[PDB]
Design an enzyme around this catalytic site. Sequence first.
Site, short mmCIF file in Angstrom:
data_model
loop_
_atom_site.label_atom_id
_atom_site.label_comp_id
_atom_site.label_asym_id
_atom_site.label_seq_id
_atom_site.Cartn_x
_atom_site.Cartn_y
_atom_site.Cartn_z
N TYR A 68 33.70 -19.95 10.05
CA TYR A 68 34.35 -19.54 11.29
C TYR A 68 33.52 -19.98 12.49
O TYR A 68 34.08 -20.37 13.52
CB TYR A 68 34.55 -18.03 11.30
CG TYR A 68 35.50 -17.57 10.22
CD1 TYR A 68 36.85 -17.95 10.24
CD2 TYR A 68 35.06 -16.77 9.16
CE1 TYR A 68 37.72 -17.55 9.23
CE2 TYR A 68 35.92 -16.38 8.14
CZ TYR A 68 37.25 -16.77 8.19
OH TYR A 68 38.11 -16.43 7.17
N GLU A 73 30.35 -15.90 0.31
CA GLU A 73 30.77 -15.06 1.45
C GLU A 73 29.98 -15.52 2.68
O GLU A 73 30.50 -15.48 3.79
CB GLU A 73 30.46 -13.56 1.21
CG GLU A 73 31.32 -12.88 0.18
CD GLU A 73 32.80 -12.98 0.50
OE1 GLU A 73 33.18 -12.75 1.66
OE2 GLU A 73 33.59 -13.27 -0.42
MN MN Z 1 34.91 -14.15 2.24
MN MN Z 2 35.30 -12.63 -1.28
#
Ligand code: MN
Ligand code: MN
Lengths: 296, 296
Positions: free
Chosen positions: B114, B107
């Site tokens: 980004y 994550e």
């Molecule tokens: Mn993610």
């Molecule tokens: Mn995820």
Amino acid sequence: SNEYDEYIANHTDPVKAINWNVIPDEKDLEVWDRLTGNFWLPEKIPVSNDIQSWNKMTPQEQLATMRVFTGLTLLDTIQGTVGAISLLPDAETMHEEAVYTNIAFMESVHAKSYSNIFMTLASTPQINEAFRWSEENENLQRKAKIIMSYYNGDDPLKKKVASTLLESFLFYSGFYLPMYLSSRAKLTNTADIIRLIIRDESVHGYYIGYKYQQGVKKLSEAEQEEYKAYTFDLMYDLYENEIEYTEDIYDDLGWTEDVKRFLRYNANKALNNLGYEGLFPTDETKVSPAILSSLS
Amino acid sequence: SNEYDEYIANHTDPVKAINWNVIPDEKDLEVWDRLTGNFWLPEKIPVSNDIQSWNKMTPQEQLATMRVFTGLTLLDTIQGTVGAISLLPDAETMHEEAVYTNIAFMESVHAKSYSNIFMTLASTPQINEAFRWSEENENLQRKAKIIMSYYNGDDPLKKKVASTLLESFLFYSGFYLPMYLSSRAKLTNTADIIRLIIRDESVHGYYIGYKYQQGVKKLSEAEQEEYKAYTFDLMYDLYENEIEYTEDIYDDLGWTEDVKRFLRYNANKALNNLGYEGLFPTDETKVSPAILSSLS
Ligand SMILES: [Mn+2]
Ligand SMILES: [Mn+2]
Ligand SMILES: [Mn+2]
Ligand SMILES: [Mn+2]
């Protein structure tokens, strides 16, 4: 629809997205690049090529190996599922939190790497006897619970101290075995996995210690003195316990004296990572150059 | 008295080292293998090749891209540093805990991805304005705080529901834009990054959803019906808030209606991941073929 209304009313500040275009502490980015650039998985090393070497080892050597690797697995399990995670809420930057998530994951990779080795080299009974021994060893359980008592406490700075001592000192009574065997041309592929693990732990210890120093330097001189006192006190307790752990594992093999020197050498490194002077004089920390190199 | 004497006495059970040779739930190993085998870093995708198509995009498209991506970054920031981590304490097996450490880490890689895109394509003022917008948008902050209220709660099953809904539903109002753009020869390299993220999130939602199902089936009749009601109530709350967010992002572009169908489509998949029937009739989830084709 309502269940969360209270939480929302008590947290009026915006939740913020991490912005990697703005880095307030350059160290966070340097360590993130370093750690992610060093990603590896145990499946990448051909451990099966150590089978011949392993089968040639004596029963004492095999037993010592199973026990040290099981002790190491336990420490990685703790650091990955409890240690690194406990550091998240005390981070100074969001990039530092991102780094801790990588540390947690790599710890799980480390722990898994030991099972890959066992599953390739040892018998089922050996593996089973090893995990049982780790549940019953008084010194192993004590070092684990001492560190966990701090992760479970409420002092952010003590969590960093415990974490740095774990990463720069507690793993070393165990790392001596594969590094020495490697210098004798034994279990060489297993040693490659160990080196990748050390390459990670070295950076983890350096980074968490750096963060500890940044936090402790914000305190009064008196407070700083108390944290240093706490650090050395914890080191005395861990050292005492590691000596007994070491004797029990290495006395049969007769490697104990050299492992104790190795413990002192790394204890100094661990203190240095926290910004303090070493505890043991250099002449009491001699390490074989064949170990220091194969270590790197 | 040692500061840790009590803790050691309040925790008699031994600390256990993870053992990958004994797997109580094969799904944990299957997911660990899939996720670790799918490791990637945004640096591996040549986003700079999208510079020309980015400059070709209209002011409206660039603005929408910046906002959607910042919204995604916010959600990944939460999932990685608060969500995945809040799931650790309630894990059924130690191998499940290892998987969550990998989810937490990936994550953080997603969130950083980004920023890599932004830094390669956008101007500093564009980046700054985007993060400010994300801090001020009431729908984005609303969805983030609702999710976080559960992660900070004490009900383990709700944390799993919130997590599956975020992973299988809340990300899609944003994933729609790069899939739309890539089918029109815009930001195609950026789209490869999005597909790698979706490849991870689809497994995350499937896995956390699976664990929710195991846990809820261990409850009494009344409790199983209550958690089912709770899940549908939250899904509707989130959908309602998402409609508003979607309208404000895509109304100028005029893509809104197709985006809303995509929302309903994914909301049904998220509920299926939790073991429940969908909330919207199939006929209300017919996203344009170009979009689903881009996901493939
Ligand atoms: Mn993610
Ligand atoms: Mn995820
Ligand atoms: Mn480790
Ligand atoms: Mn470490």
